[PDB]
Design a protein around this ligand. Structure first.
Ligand SMILES: *[C@@H]1O[C@H](CO)[C@@H](O[C@@H]2O[C@H](CO)[C@@H](O)[C@H](O)[C@H]2NC(C)=O)[C@H](O)[C@H]1NC(C)=O
Ligand SMILES: *[C@@H]1O[C@H](CO)[C@@H](O[C@@H]2O[C@H](CO)[C@@H](O)[C@H](O)[C@H]2NC(C)=O)[C@H](O)[C@H]1NC(C)=O
Ligand SMILES: *[C@@H]1O[C@H](CO)[C@@H](O)[C@H](O)[C@H]1NC(C)=O
Ligand SMILES: O=C(O)c1cccnc1
Ligand SMILES: [Fe+3]
Ligand SMILES: [Zn+2]
Ligand SMILES: [Zn+2]
Length: 341
Protein backbone atom coordinates (compact mmCIF):
# COMPACT_ATOMS: atom_id res chain seq x y z
CA UNK A 1 0.00 0.00 0.00
CA UNK A 2 2.45 2.67 1.20
CA UNK A 3 4.94 -0.04 0.24
CA UNK A 4 7.05 0.43 -2.90
CA UNK A 5 8.51 -2.35 -5.04
CA UNK A 6 11.86 -1.33 -6.46
CA UNK A 7 13.22 -3.02 -9.57
CA UNK A 8 16.84 -4.15 -9.34
CA UNK A 9 18.85 -4.89 -12.48
CA UNK A 10 21.02 -7.98 -12.06
CA UNK A 11 22.47 -9.79 -8.94
CA UNK A 12 24.40 -7.01 -7.21
CA UNK A 13 21.55 -4.49 -7.29
CA UNK A 14 19.31 -7.22 -5.92
CA UNK A 15 21.66 -7.69 -3.00
CA UNK A 16 21.78 -3.94 -2.29
CA UNK A 17 18.01 -3.72 -2.67
CA UNK A 18 17.49 -6.58 -0.19
CA UNK A 19 19.55 -4.71 2.44
CA UNK A 20 17.56 -1.51 1.84
CA UNK A 21 14.35 -3.54 1.99
CA UNK A 22 15.42 -4.90 5.37
CA UNK A 23 16.47 -1.55 6.86
CA UNK A 24 13.17 0.03 5.75
CA UNK A 25 11.05 -2.54 7.56
CA UNK A 26 9.62 -3.65 4.22
CA UNK A 27 8.39 -0.18 3.30
CA UNK A 28 10.42 -1.00 0.20
CA UNK A 29 10.57 -4.45 -1.34
CA UNK A 30 12.43 -5.75 -4.37
CA UNK A 31 11.84 -7.20 -7.81
CA UNK A 32 14.79 -8.30 -9.94
CA UNK A 33 15.34 -8.53 -13.71
CA UNK A 34 18.33 -9.19 -16.00
CA UNK A 35 18.03 -5.99 -18.02
CA UNK A 36 16.74 -2.44 -17.58
CA UNK A 37 14.20 -3.13 -20.36
CA UNK A 38 12.79 -6.06 -18.40
CA UNK A 39 12.50 -3.88 -15.32
CA UNK A 40 10.61 -1.30 -17.40
CA UNK A 41 8.25 -4.12 -18.40
CA UNK A 42 7.66 -5.13 -14.76
CA UNK A 43 6.64 -1.54 -13.94
CA UNK A 44 4.18 -1.48 -16.89
CA UNK A 45 2.68 -4.77 -15.72
CA UNK A 46 2.45 -3.28 -12.24
CA UNK A 47 4.57 -6.05 -10.77
CA UNK A 48 7.17 -3.33 -9.68
CA UNK A 49 6.76 0.42 -8.97
CA UNK A 50 10.00 2.25 -9.76
CA UNK A 51 13.72 2.34 -10.66
CA UNK A 52 16.30 5.03 -11.36
CA UNK A 53 17.21 5.41 -15.06
CA UNK A 54 19.70 7.08 -17.40
CA UNK A 55 18.20 9.52 -19.96
CA UNK A 56 18.21 7.04 -22.82
CA UNK A 57 15.96 4.60 -20.96
CA UNK A 58 13.79 7.49 -19.73
CA UNK A 59 13.01 8.00 -23.41
CA UNK A 60 12.05 4.32 -23.84
CA UNK A 61 9.98 4.33 -20.67
CA UNK A 62 8.25 7.60 -21.55
CA UNK A 63 6.96 6.25 -24.86
CA UNK A 64 5.22 3.62 -22.75
CA UNK A 65 3.70 6.15 -20.38
CA UNK A 66 6.17 6.03 -17.48
CA UNK A 67 6.97 9.41 -15.92
CA UNK A 68 9.94 11.14 -14.25
CA UNK A 69 9.30 11.40 -10.49
CA UNK A 70 12.52 12.66 -8.85
CA UNK A 71 16.00 13.27 -10.28
CA UNK A 72 19.52 12.56 -9.09
CA UNK A 73 21.21 15.70 -7.84
CA UNK A 74 24.97 15.79 -7.21
CA UNK A 75 26.88 18.59 -5.49
CA UNK A 76 27.07 22.10 -7.02
CA UNK A 77 28.80 25.39 -6.17
CA UNK A 78 25.82 27.40 -7.51
CA UNK A 79 22.28 27.35 -5.97
CA UNK A 80 24.21 26.08 -2.89
CA UNK A 81 22.05 28.44 -0.85
CA UNK A 82 19.04 26.27 -1.80
CA UNK A 83 18.39 22.88 -0.17
CA UNK A 84 19.38 19.89 -2.32
CA UNK A 85 15.83 18.55 -2.77
CA UNK A 86 14.69 21.93 -4.20
CA UNK A 87 17.86 22.85 -6.15
CA UNK A 88 17.55 22.51 -9.95
CA UNK A 89 19.53 19.72 -11.61
CA UNK A 90 22.58 20.68 -13.65
CA UNK A 91 23.10 17.74 -15.96
CA UNK A 92 26.33 15.89 -16.49
CA UNK A 93 29.05 16.16 -19.10
CA UNK A 94 29.25 13.42 -21.74
CA UNK A 95 32.97 13.08 -22.65
CA UNK A 96 35.28 10.93 -24.82
CA UNK A 97 38.38 9.78 -22.97
CA UNK A 98 41.69 8.35 -24.19
CA UNK A 99 45.10 7.52 -22.73
CA UNK A 100 47.62 10.32 -23.21
CA UNK A 101 50.29 7.84 -24.36
CA UNK A 102 47.99 7.01 -27.30
CA UNK A 103 49.34 10.09 -29.07
CA UNK A 104 47.70 11.53 -32.17
CA UNK A 105 44.34 9.88 -31.45
CA UNK A 106 41.68 12.57 -31.88
CA UNK A 107 37.92 12.72 -32.63
CA UNK A 108 38.76 12.68 -36.33
CA UNK A 109 40.85 9.52 -36.20
CA UNK A 110 38.42 7.28 -34.32
CA UNK A 111 37.49 5.11 -37.33
CA UNK A 112 38.62 1.49 -36.88
CA UNK A 113 39.70 2.05 -33.27
CA UNK A 114 38.52 0.11 -30.20
CA UNK A 115 35.73 1.59 -28.09
CA UNK A 116 34.20 1.18 -24.62
CA UNK A 117 30.57 2.15 -24.00
CA UNK A 118 28.47 2.08 -20.82
CA UNK A 119 25.70 0.05 -22.53
CA UNK A 120 23.68 0.33 -25.73
CA UNK A 121 20.87 2.95 -25.46
CA UNK A 122 22.53 4.97 -22.70
CA UNK A 123 23.17 8.73 -22.95
CA UNK A 124 26.93 9.27 -22.70
CA UNK A 125 27.90 5.72 -23.54
CA UNK A 126 25.84 5.36 -26.70
CA UNK A 127 23.23 7.92 -27.77
CA UNK A 128 25.46 11.03 -27.83
CA UNK A 129 28.60 9.51 -29.38
CA UNK A 130 26.86 7.27 -31.97
CA UNK A 131 24.31 9.90 -32.93
CA UNK A 132 27.24 12.21 -33.50
CA UNK A 133 29.09 9.58 -35.54
CA UNK A 134 26.05 8.70 -37.68
CA UNK A 135 25.55 12.36 -38.41
CA UNK A 136 29.18 12.95 -39.35
CA UNK A 137 29.52 9.87 -41.60
CA UNK A 138 26.12 10.03 -43.32
CA UNK A 139 25.74 6.33 -42.60
CA UNK A 140 23.69 4.17 -40.21
CA UNK A 141 26.38 1.50 -40.20
CA UNK A 142 27.59 2.36 -36.65
CA UNK A 143 28.15 -1.39 -36.11
CA UNK A 144 31.06 -1.04 -38.55
CA UNK A 145 32.73 2.21 -37.37
CA UNK A 146 34.96 0.76 -34.64
CA UNK A 147 37.05 -2.32 -35.29
CA UNK A 148 35.94 -3.75 -31.92
CA UNK A 149 33.96 -2.61 -28.89
CA UNK A 150 32.42 -3.53 -25.58
CA UNK A 151 28.87 -2.20 -25.86
CA UNK A 152 26.67 -4.12 -23.38
CA UNK A 153 23.32 -5.09 -24.82
CA UNK A 154 24.44 -5.65 -28.42
CA UNK A 155 24.62 -9.14 -30.04
CA UNK A 156 27.25 -11.23 -28.13
CA UNK A 157 28.51 -12.65 -31.47
CA UNK A 158 28.94 -9.16 -32.99
CA UNK A 159 32.06 -6.98 -32.95
CA UNK A 160 30.27 -4.56 -30.60
CA UNK A 161 30.60 -7.24 -27.90
CA UNK A 162 34.04 -8.56 -28.85
CA UNK A 163 35.82 -6.51 -26.16
CA UNK A 164 33.35 -7.42 -23.33
CA UNK A 165 34.61 -9.90 -20.71
CA UNK A 166 31.62 -11.33 -18.84
CA UNK A 167 31.81 -12.18 -15.14
CA UNK A 168 34.44 -13.90 -12.89
CA UNK A 169 33.77 -17.07 -14.89
CA UNK A 170 33.40 -15.80 -18.43
CA UNK A 171 29.62 -16.09 -18.36
CA UNK A 172 27.14 -13.30 -19.20
CA UNK A 173 29.41 -11.71 -21.79
CA UNK A 174 27.95 -8.38 -22.95
CA UNK A 175 24.86 -8.47 -20.66
CA UNK A 176 23.67 -4.96 -19.88
CA UNK A 177 24.05 -5.33 -16.11
CA UNK A 178 26.90 -5.16 -13.60
CA UNK A 179 27.78 -8.85 -14.05
CA UNK A 180 29.55 -7.75 -17.23
CA UNK A 181 32.99 -6.52 -16.17
CA UNK A 182 32.99 -3.49 -18.51
CA UNK A 183 29.37 -2.40 -17.96
CA UNK A 184 28.31 1.11 -16.95
CA UNK A 185 30.34 4.25 -16.30
CA UNK A 186 32.96 2.45 -14.20
CA UNK A 187 33.21 -0.64 -16.43
CA UNK A 188 33.67 1.42 -19.58
CA UNK A 189 36.41 3.48 -17.97
CA UNK A 190 38.06 0.26 -16.73
CA UNK A 191 37.96 -1.03 -20.31
CA UNK A 192 40.10 1.94 -21.28
CA UNK A 193 42.25 1.99 -18.13
CA UNK A 194 43.22 -1.62 -18.97
CA UNK A 195 43.88 -0.82 -22.65
CA UNK A 196 41.18 -3.13 -23.96
CA UNK A 197 39.80 -0.18 -25.87
CA UNK A 198 41.27 3.03 -27.28
CA UNK A 199 38.38 5.19 -26.15
CA UNK A 200 35.64 5.24 -23.50
CA UNK A 201 32.42 7.24 -23.58
CA UNK A 202 31.56 8.06 -20.02
CA UNK A 203 30.83 11.28 -18.14
CA UNK A 204 33.24 13.74 -16.64
CA UNK A 205 32.68 12.59 -13.08
CA UNK A 206 33.85 9.00 -13.79
CA UNK A 207 37.44 10.05 -14.62
CA UNK A 208 37.82 12.07 -11.43
CA UNK A 209 36.28 9.34 -9.30
CA UNK A 210 38.61 6.55 -10.48
CA UNK A 211 41.94 8.38 -10.63
CA UNK A 212 44.44 9.86 -8.12
CA UNK A 213 43.56 7.54 -5.25
CA UNK A 214 39.82 8.29 -5.28
CA UNK A 215 38.95 4.64 -5.93
CA UNK A 216 41.29 2.17 -4.11
CA UNK A 217 39.89 -0.59 -6.36
CA UNK A 218 42.78 -2.72 -7.64
CA UNK A 219 42.57 -1.65 -11.34
CA UNK A 220 42.19 2.04 -10.38
CA UNK A 221 44.75 2.37 -7.52
CA UNK A 222 47.56 3.74 -9.66
CA UNK A 223 45.45 5.61 -12.24
CA UNK A 224 46.64 9.22 -12.65
CA UNK A 225 44.51 11.97 -14.32
CA UNK A 226 47.43 13.35 -16.26
CA UNK A 227 47.59 10.02 -18.05
CA UNK A 228 44.22 10.71 -19.69
CA UNK A 229 42.91 13.18 -22.29
CA UNK A 230 39.45 14.28 -23.41
CA UNK A 231 38.65 14.35 -27.11
CA UNK A 232 36.93 17.59 -28.21
CA UNK A 233 34.72 17.91 -31.27
CA UNK A 234 37.14 20.37 -32.96
CA UNK A 235 39.83 17.69 -33.42
CA UNK A 236 41.74 18.79 -30.32
CA UNK A 237 42.84 17.00 -27.06
CA UNK A 238 42.57 18.53 -23.62
CA UNK A 239 43.38 17.73 -20.00
CA UNK A 240 40.49 16.25 -18.04
CA UNK A 241 40.36 19.53 -16.09
CA UNK A 242 38.89 21.16 -19.21
CA UNK A 243 35.58 19.28 -19.66
CA UNK A 244 33.45 22.46 -19.62
CA UNK A 245 35.01 23.29 -23.00
CA UNK A 246 35.68 19.78 -24.29
CA UNK A 247 32.54 17.61 -23.94
CA UNK A 248 30.27 15.85 -26.44
CA UNK A 249 27.12 17.09 -24.66
CA UNK A 250 25.54 17.94 -21.31
CA UNK A 251 23.18 15.17 -20.23
CA UNK A 252 19.93 15.20 -18.26
CA UNK A 253 20.46 13.58 -14.87
CA UNK A 254 19.45 10.01 -14.11
CA UNK A 255 15.95 10.03 -12.66
CA UNK A 256 13.45 7.75 -10.92
CA UNK A 257 10.52 6.77 -13.13
CA UNK A 258 7.20 5.12 -12.36
CA UNK A 259 3.83 4.57 -13.90
CA UNK A 260 2.01 7.88 -13.86
CA UNK A 261 -0.75 6.45 -11.69
CA UNK A 262 1.78 5.45 -8.97
CA UNK A 263 3.96 8.60 -9.09
CA UNK A 264 2.59 10.55 -6.10
CA UNK A 265 2.95 7.52 -3.85
CA UNK A 266 6.45 6.59 -5.02
CA UNK A 267 7.54 10.21 -4.57
CA UNK A 268 6.25 10.37 -0.99
CA UNK A 269 8.01 7.17 0.09
CA UNK A 270 11.32 8.09 -1.55
CA UNK A 271 11.60 11.49 0.14
CA UNK A 272 11.17 9.73 3.51
CA UNK A 273 13.58 6.94 2.57
CA UNK A 274 16.25 9.49 1.78
CA UNK A 275 15.56 11.46 4.96
CA UNK A 276 16.58 8.14 6.57
CA UNK A 277 19.33 6.78 4.30
CA UNK A 278 20.42 9.84 2.29
CA UNK A 279 23.63 11.89 2.55
CA UNK A 280 23.10 13.16 6.12
CA UNK A 281 20.22 10.82 6.76
CA UNK A 282 19.41 9.52 10.24
CA UNK A 283 20.67 6.02 9.51
CA UNK A 284 23.01 6.31 6.60
CA UNK A 285 26.57 6.31 7.85
CA UNK A 286 25.50 4.08 10.74
CA UNK A 287 23.11 1.43 9.38
CA UNK A 288 22.69 1.90 5.64
CA UNK A 289 23.51 4.37 2.91
CA UNK A 290 21.38 4.44 -0.22
CA UNK A 291 23.88 6.35 -2.31
CA UNK A 292 26.91 4.16 -1.50
CA UNK A 293 28.14 0.88 -3.02
CA UNK A 294 31.91 1.41 -3.31
CA UNK A 295 32.35 3.03 -6.79
CA UNK A 296 29.85 0.53 -8.31
CA UNK A 297 26.79 2.83 -8.93
CA UNK A 298 24.18 0.26 -7.81
CA UNK A 299 20.54 1.53 -7.93
CA UNK A 300 21.90 5.10 -7.83
CA UNK A 301 25.17 6.76 -8.80
CA UNK A 302 27.47 6.96 -5.80
CA UNK A 303 27.93 10.74 -6.24
CA UNK A 304 24.23 11.50 -5.59
CA UNK A 305 23.77 14.11 -2.83
CA UNK A 306 19.99 13.63 -2.94
CA UNK A 307 16.98 12.95 -5.18
CA UNK A 308 15.47 16.30 -6.20
CA UNK A 309 11.88 17.39 -6.87
CA UNK A 310 11.31 18.45 -10.44
CA UNK A 311 9.03 21.50 -10.69
CA UNK A 312 7.19 22.45 -13.81
CA UNK A 313 5.82 18.91 -13.42
CA UNK A 314 7.65 17.85 -16.54
CA UNK A 315 6.64 15.23 -19.02
CA UNK A 316 9.50 13.00 -20.05
CA UNK A 317 10.03 15.19 -23.15
CA UNK A 318 10.23 18.43 -21.11
CA UNK A 319 12.56 16.54 -18.73
CA UNK A 320 14.98 15.36 -21.41
CA UNK A 321 14.66 18.53 -23.53
CA UNK A 322 14.00 19.03 -27.28
CA UNK A 323 17.75 18.88 -28.01
CA UNK A 324 18.20 15.39 -26.61
CA UNK A 325 14.84 13.99 -27.77
CA UNK A 326 15.51 14.97 -31.40
CA UNK A 327 18.99 13.41 -31.23
CA UNK A 328 17.55 10.10 -29.98
CA UNK A 329 14.76 10.08 -32.56
CA UNK A 330 17.25 10.76 -35.32
CA UNK A 331 19.56 7.92 -34.15
CA UNK A 332 16.70 5.49 -33.48
CA UNK A 333 15.73 5.76 -37.17
CA UNK A 334 18.86 3.74 -38.04
CA UNK A 335 17.76 0.74 -35.99
CA UNK A 336 7.04 4.65 -36.23
CA UNK A 337 5.68 6.12 -32.93
CA UNK A 338 4.85 3.57 -30.17
CA UNK A 339 5.84 1.76 -26.95
CA UNK A 340 8.62 -0.65 -27.93
CA UNK A 341 7.00 -3.50 -25.94
C1 LIG B 1 22.51 14.83 -36.05
O1 LIG B 1 22.01 15.50 -37.19
C2 LIG B 1 20.71 15.77 -36.93
C3 LIG B 1 20.02 16.32 -38.18
O2 LIG B 1 20.56 17.59 -38.51
C4 LIG B 1 20.82 16.59 -35.69
O3 LIG B 1 19.62 16.66 -35.30
C5 LIG B 1 18.57 17.72 -35.38
O4 LIG B 1 18.89 18.39 -34.14
C6 LIG B 1 18.71 19.79 -34.18
C7 LIG B 1 18.93 20.27 -32.73
O5 LIG B 1 18.10 19.53 -31.83
C8 LIG B 1 17.30 20.10 -34.67
O6 LIG B 1 17.23 21.49 -34.94
C9 LIG B 1 16.90 19.34 -35.95
O7 LIG B 1 15.50 19.33 -36.04
C10 LIG B 1 17.26 17.93 -35.89
N1 LIG B 1 17.25 17.32 -37.22
C11 LIG B 1 16.58 16.19 -37.44
C12 LIG B 1 16.86 15.44 -38.73
O8 LIG B 1 15.74 15.76 -36.66
C13 LIG B 1 21.30 15.94 -34.50
O9 LIG B 1 21.08 16.79 -33.38
C14 LIG B 1 22.65 15.65 -34.77
N2 LIG B 1 23.12 14.77 -33.74
C15 LIG B 1 24.05 15.19 -32.91
C16 LIG B 1 24.55 14.19 -31.89
O10 LIG B 1 24.52 16.33 -32.94
C1 LIG C 1 33.65 16.62 -13.53
O1 LIG C 1 33.66 15.65 -12.52
C2 LIG C 1 34.38 15.94 -11.39
C3 LIG C 1 33.98 14.87 -10.37
O2 LIG C 1 32.58 14.89 -10.16
C4 LIG C 1 34.04 17.34 -10.96
O3 LIG C 1 35.07 17.61 -10.11
C5 LIG C 1 34.60 18.03 -8.79
O4 LIG C 1 34.27 19.38 -8.94
C6 LIG C 1 33.44 19.78 -7.88
C7 LIG C 1 33.00 21.21 -8.14
O5 LIG C 1 32.02 21.26 -9.17
C8 LIG C 1 34.23 19.59 -6.59
O6 LIG C 1 33.39 19.88 -5.50
C9 LIG C 1 34.82 18.16 -6.45
O7 LIG C 1 35.70 18.12 -5.34
C10 LIG C 1 35.57 17.75 -7.69
N1 LIG C 1 35.86 16.32 -7.68
C11 LIG C 1 37.09 15.82 -7.60
C12 LIG C 1 37.23 14.37 -7.15
O8 LIG C 1 38.10 16.47 -7.86
C13 LIG C 1 34.18 18.43 -11.99
O9 LIG C 1 33.61 19.63 -11.50
C14 LIG C 1 33.45 18.07 -13.16
N2 LIG C 1 33.88 18.94 -14.26
C15 LIG C 1 32.99 19.61 -14.98
C16 LIG C 1 33.51 20.51 -16.10
O10 LIG C 1 31.78 19.53 -14.78
C1 LIG D 1 7.57 2.88 7.12
O1 LIG D 1 6.46 3.71 6.76
C2 LIG D 1 5.72 4.26 7.88
C3 LIG D 1 4.62 5.15 7.29
O2 LIG D 1 5.21 6.21 6.57
C4 LIG D 1 6.65 5.08 8.79
O3 LIG D 1 5.94 5.51 9.95
C5 LIG D 1 7.88 4.27 9.20
O4 LIG D 1 8.79 5.11 9.89
C6 LIG D 1 8.57 3.65 7.99
N1 LIG D 1 9.62 2.74 8.43
C7 LIG D 1 10.83 2.70 7.85
C8 LIG D 1 11.93 1.93 8.59
O5 LIG D 1 11.10 3.24 6.77
O1 LIG E 1 12.71 21.31 -24.33
C1 LIG E 1 13.27 21.60 -23.29
O2 LIG E 1 12.58 21.56 -22.12
C2 LIG E 1 14.72 22.01 -23.29
C3 LIG E 1 15.47 22.07 -24.51
C4 LIG E 1 16.83 22.46 -24.46
C5 LIG E 1 17.39 22.79 -23.22
N1 LIG E 1 16.67 22.73 -22.09
C6 LIG E 1 15.38 22.37 -22.08
FE1 LIG F 1 24.12 7.67 -17.48
ZN1 LIG G 1 28.21 21.90 -24.57
ZN1 LIG H 1 5.49 21.48 -17.99
Amino acid sequence: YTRVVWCAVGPEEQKKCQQWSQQSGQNVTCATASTTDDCIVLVLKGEADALNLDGGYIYTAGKCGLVPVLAENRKSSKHSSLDCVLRPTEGYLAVAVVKKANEGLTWNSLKDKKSCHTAVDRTAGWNIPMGLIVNQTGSCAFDEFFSQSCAPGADPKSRLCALCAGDDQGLDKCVPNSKEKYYGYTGAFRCLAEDVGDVAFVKNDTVWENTNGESTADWAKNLKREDFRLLCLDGTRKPVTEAQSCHLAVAPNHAVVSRSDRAAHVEQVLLHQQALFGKNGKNCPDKFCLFKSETKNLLFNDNTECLAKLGGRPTYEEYLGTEYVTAIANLKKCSLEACAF
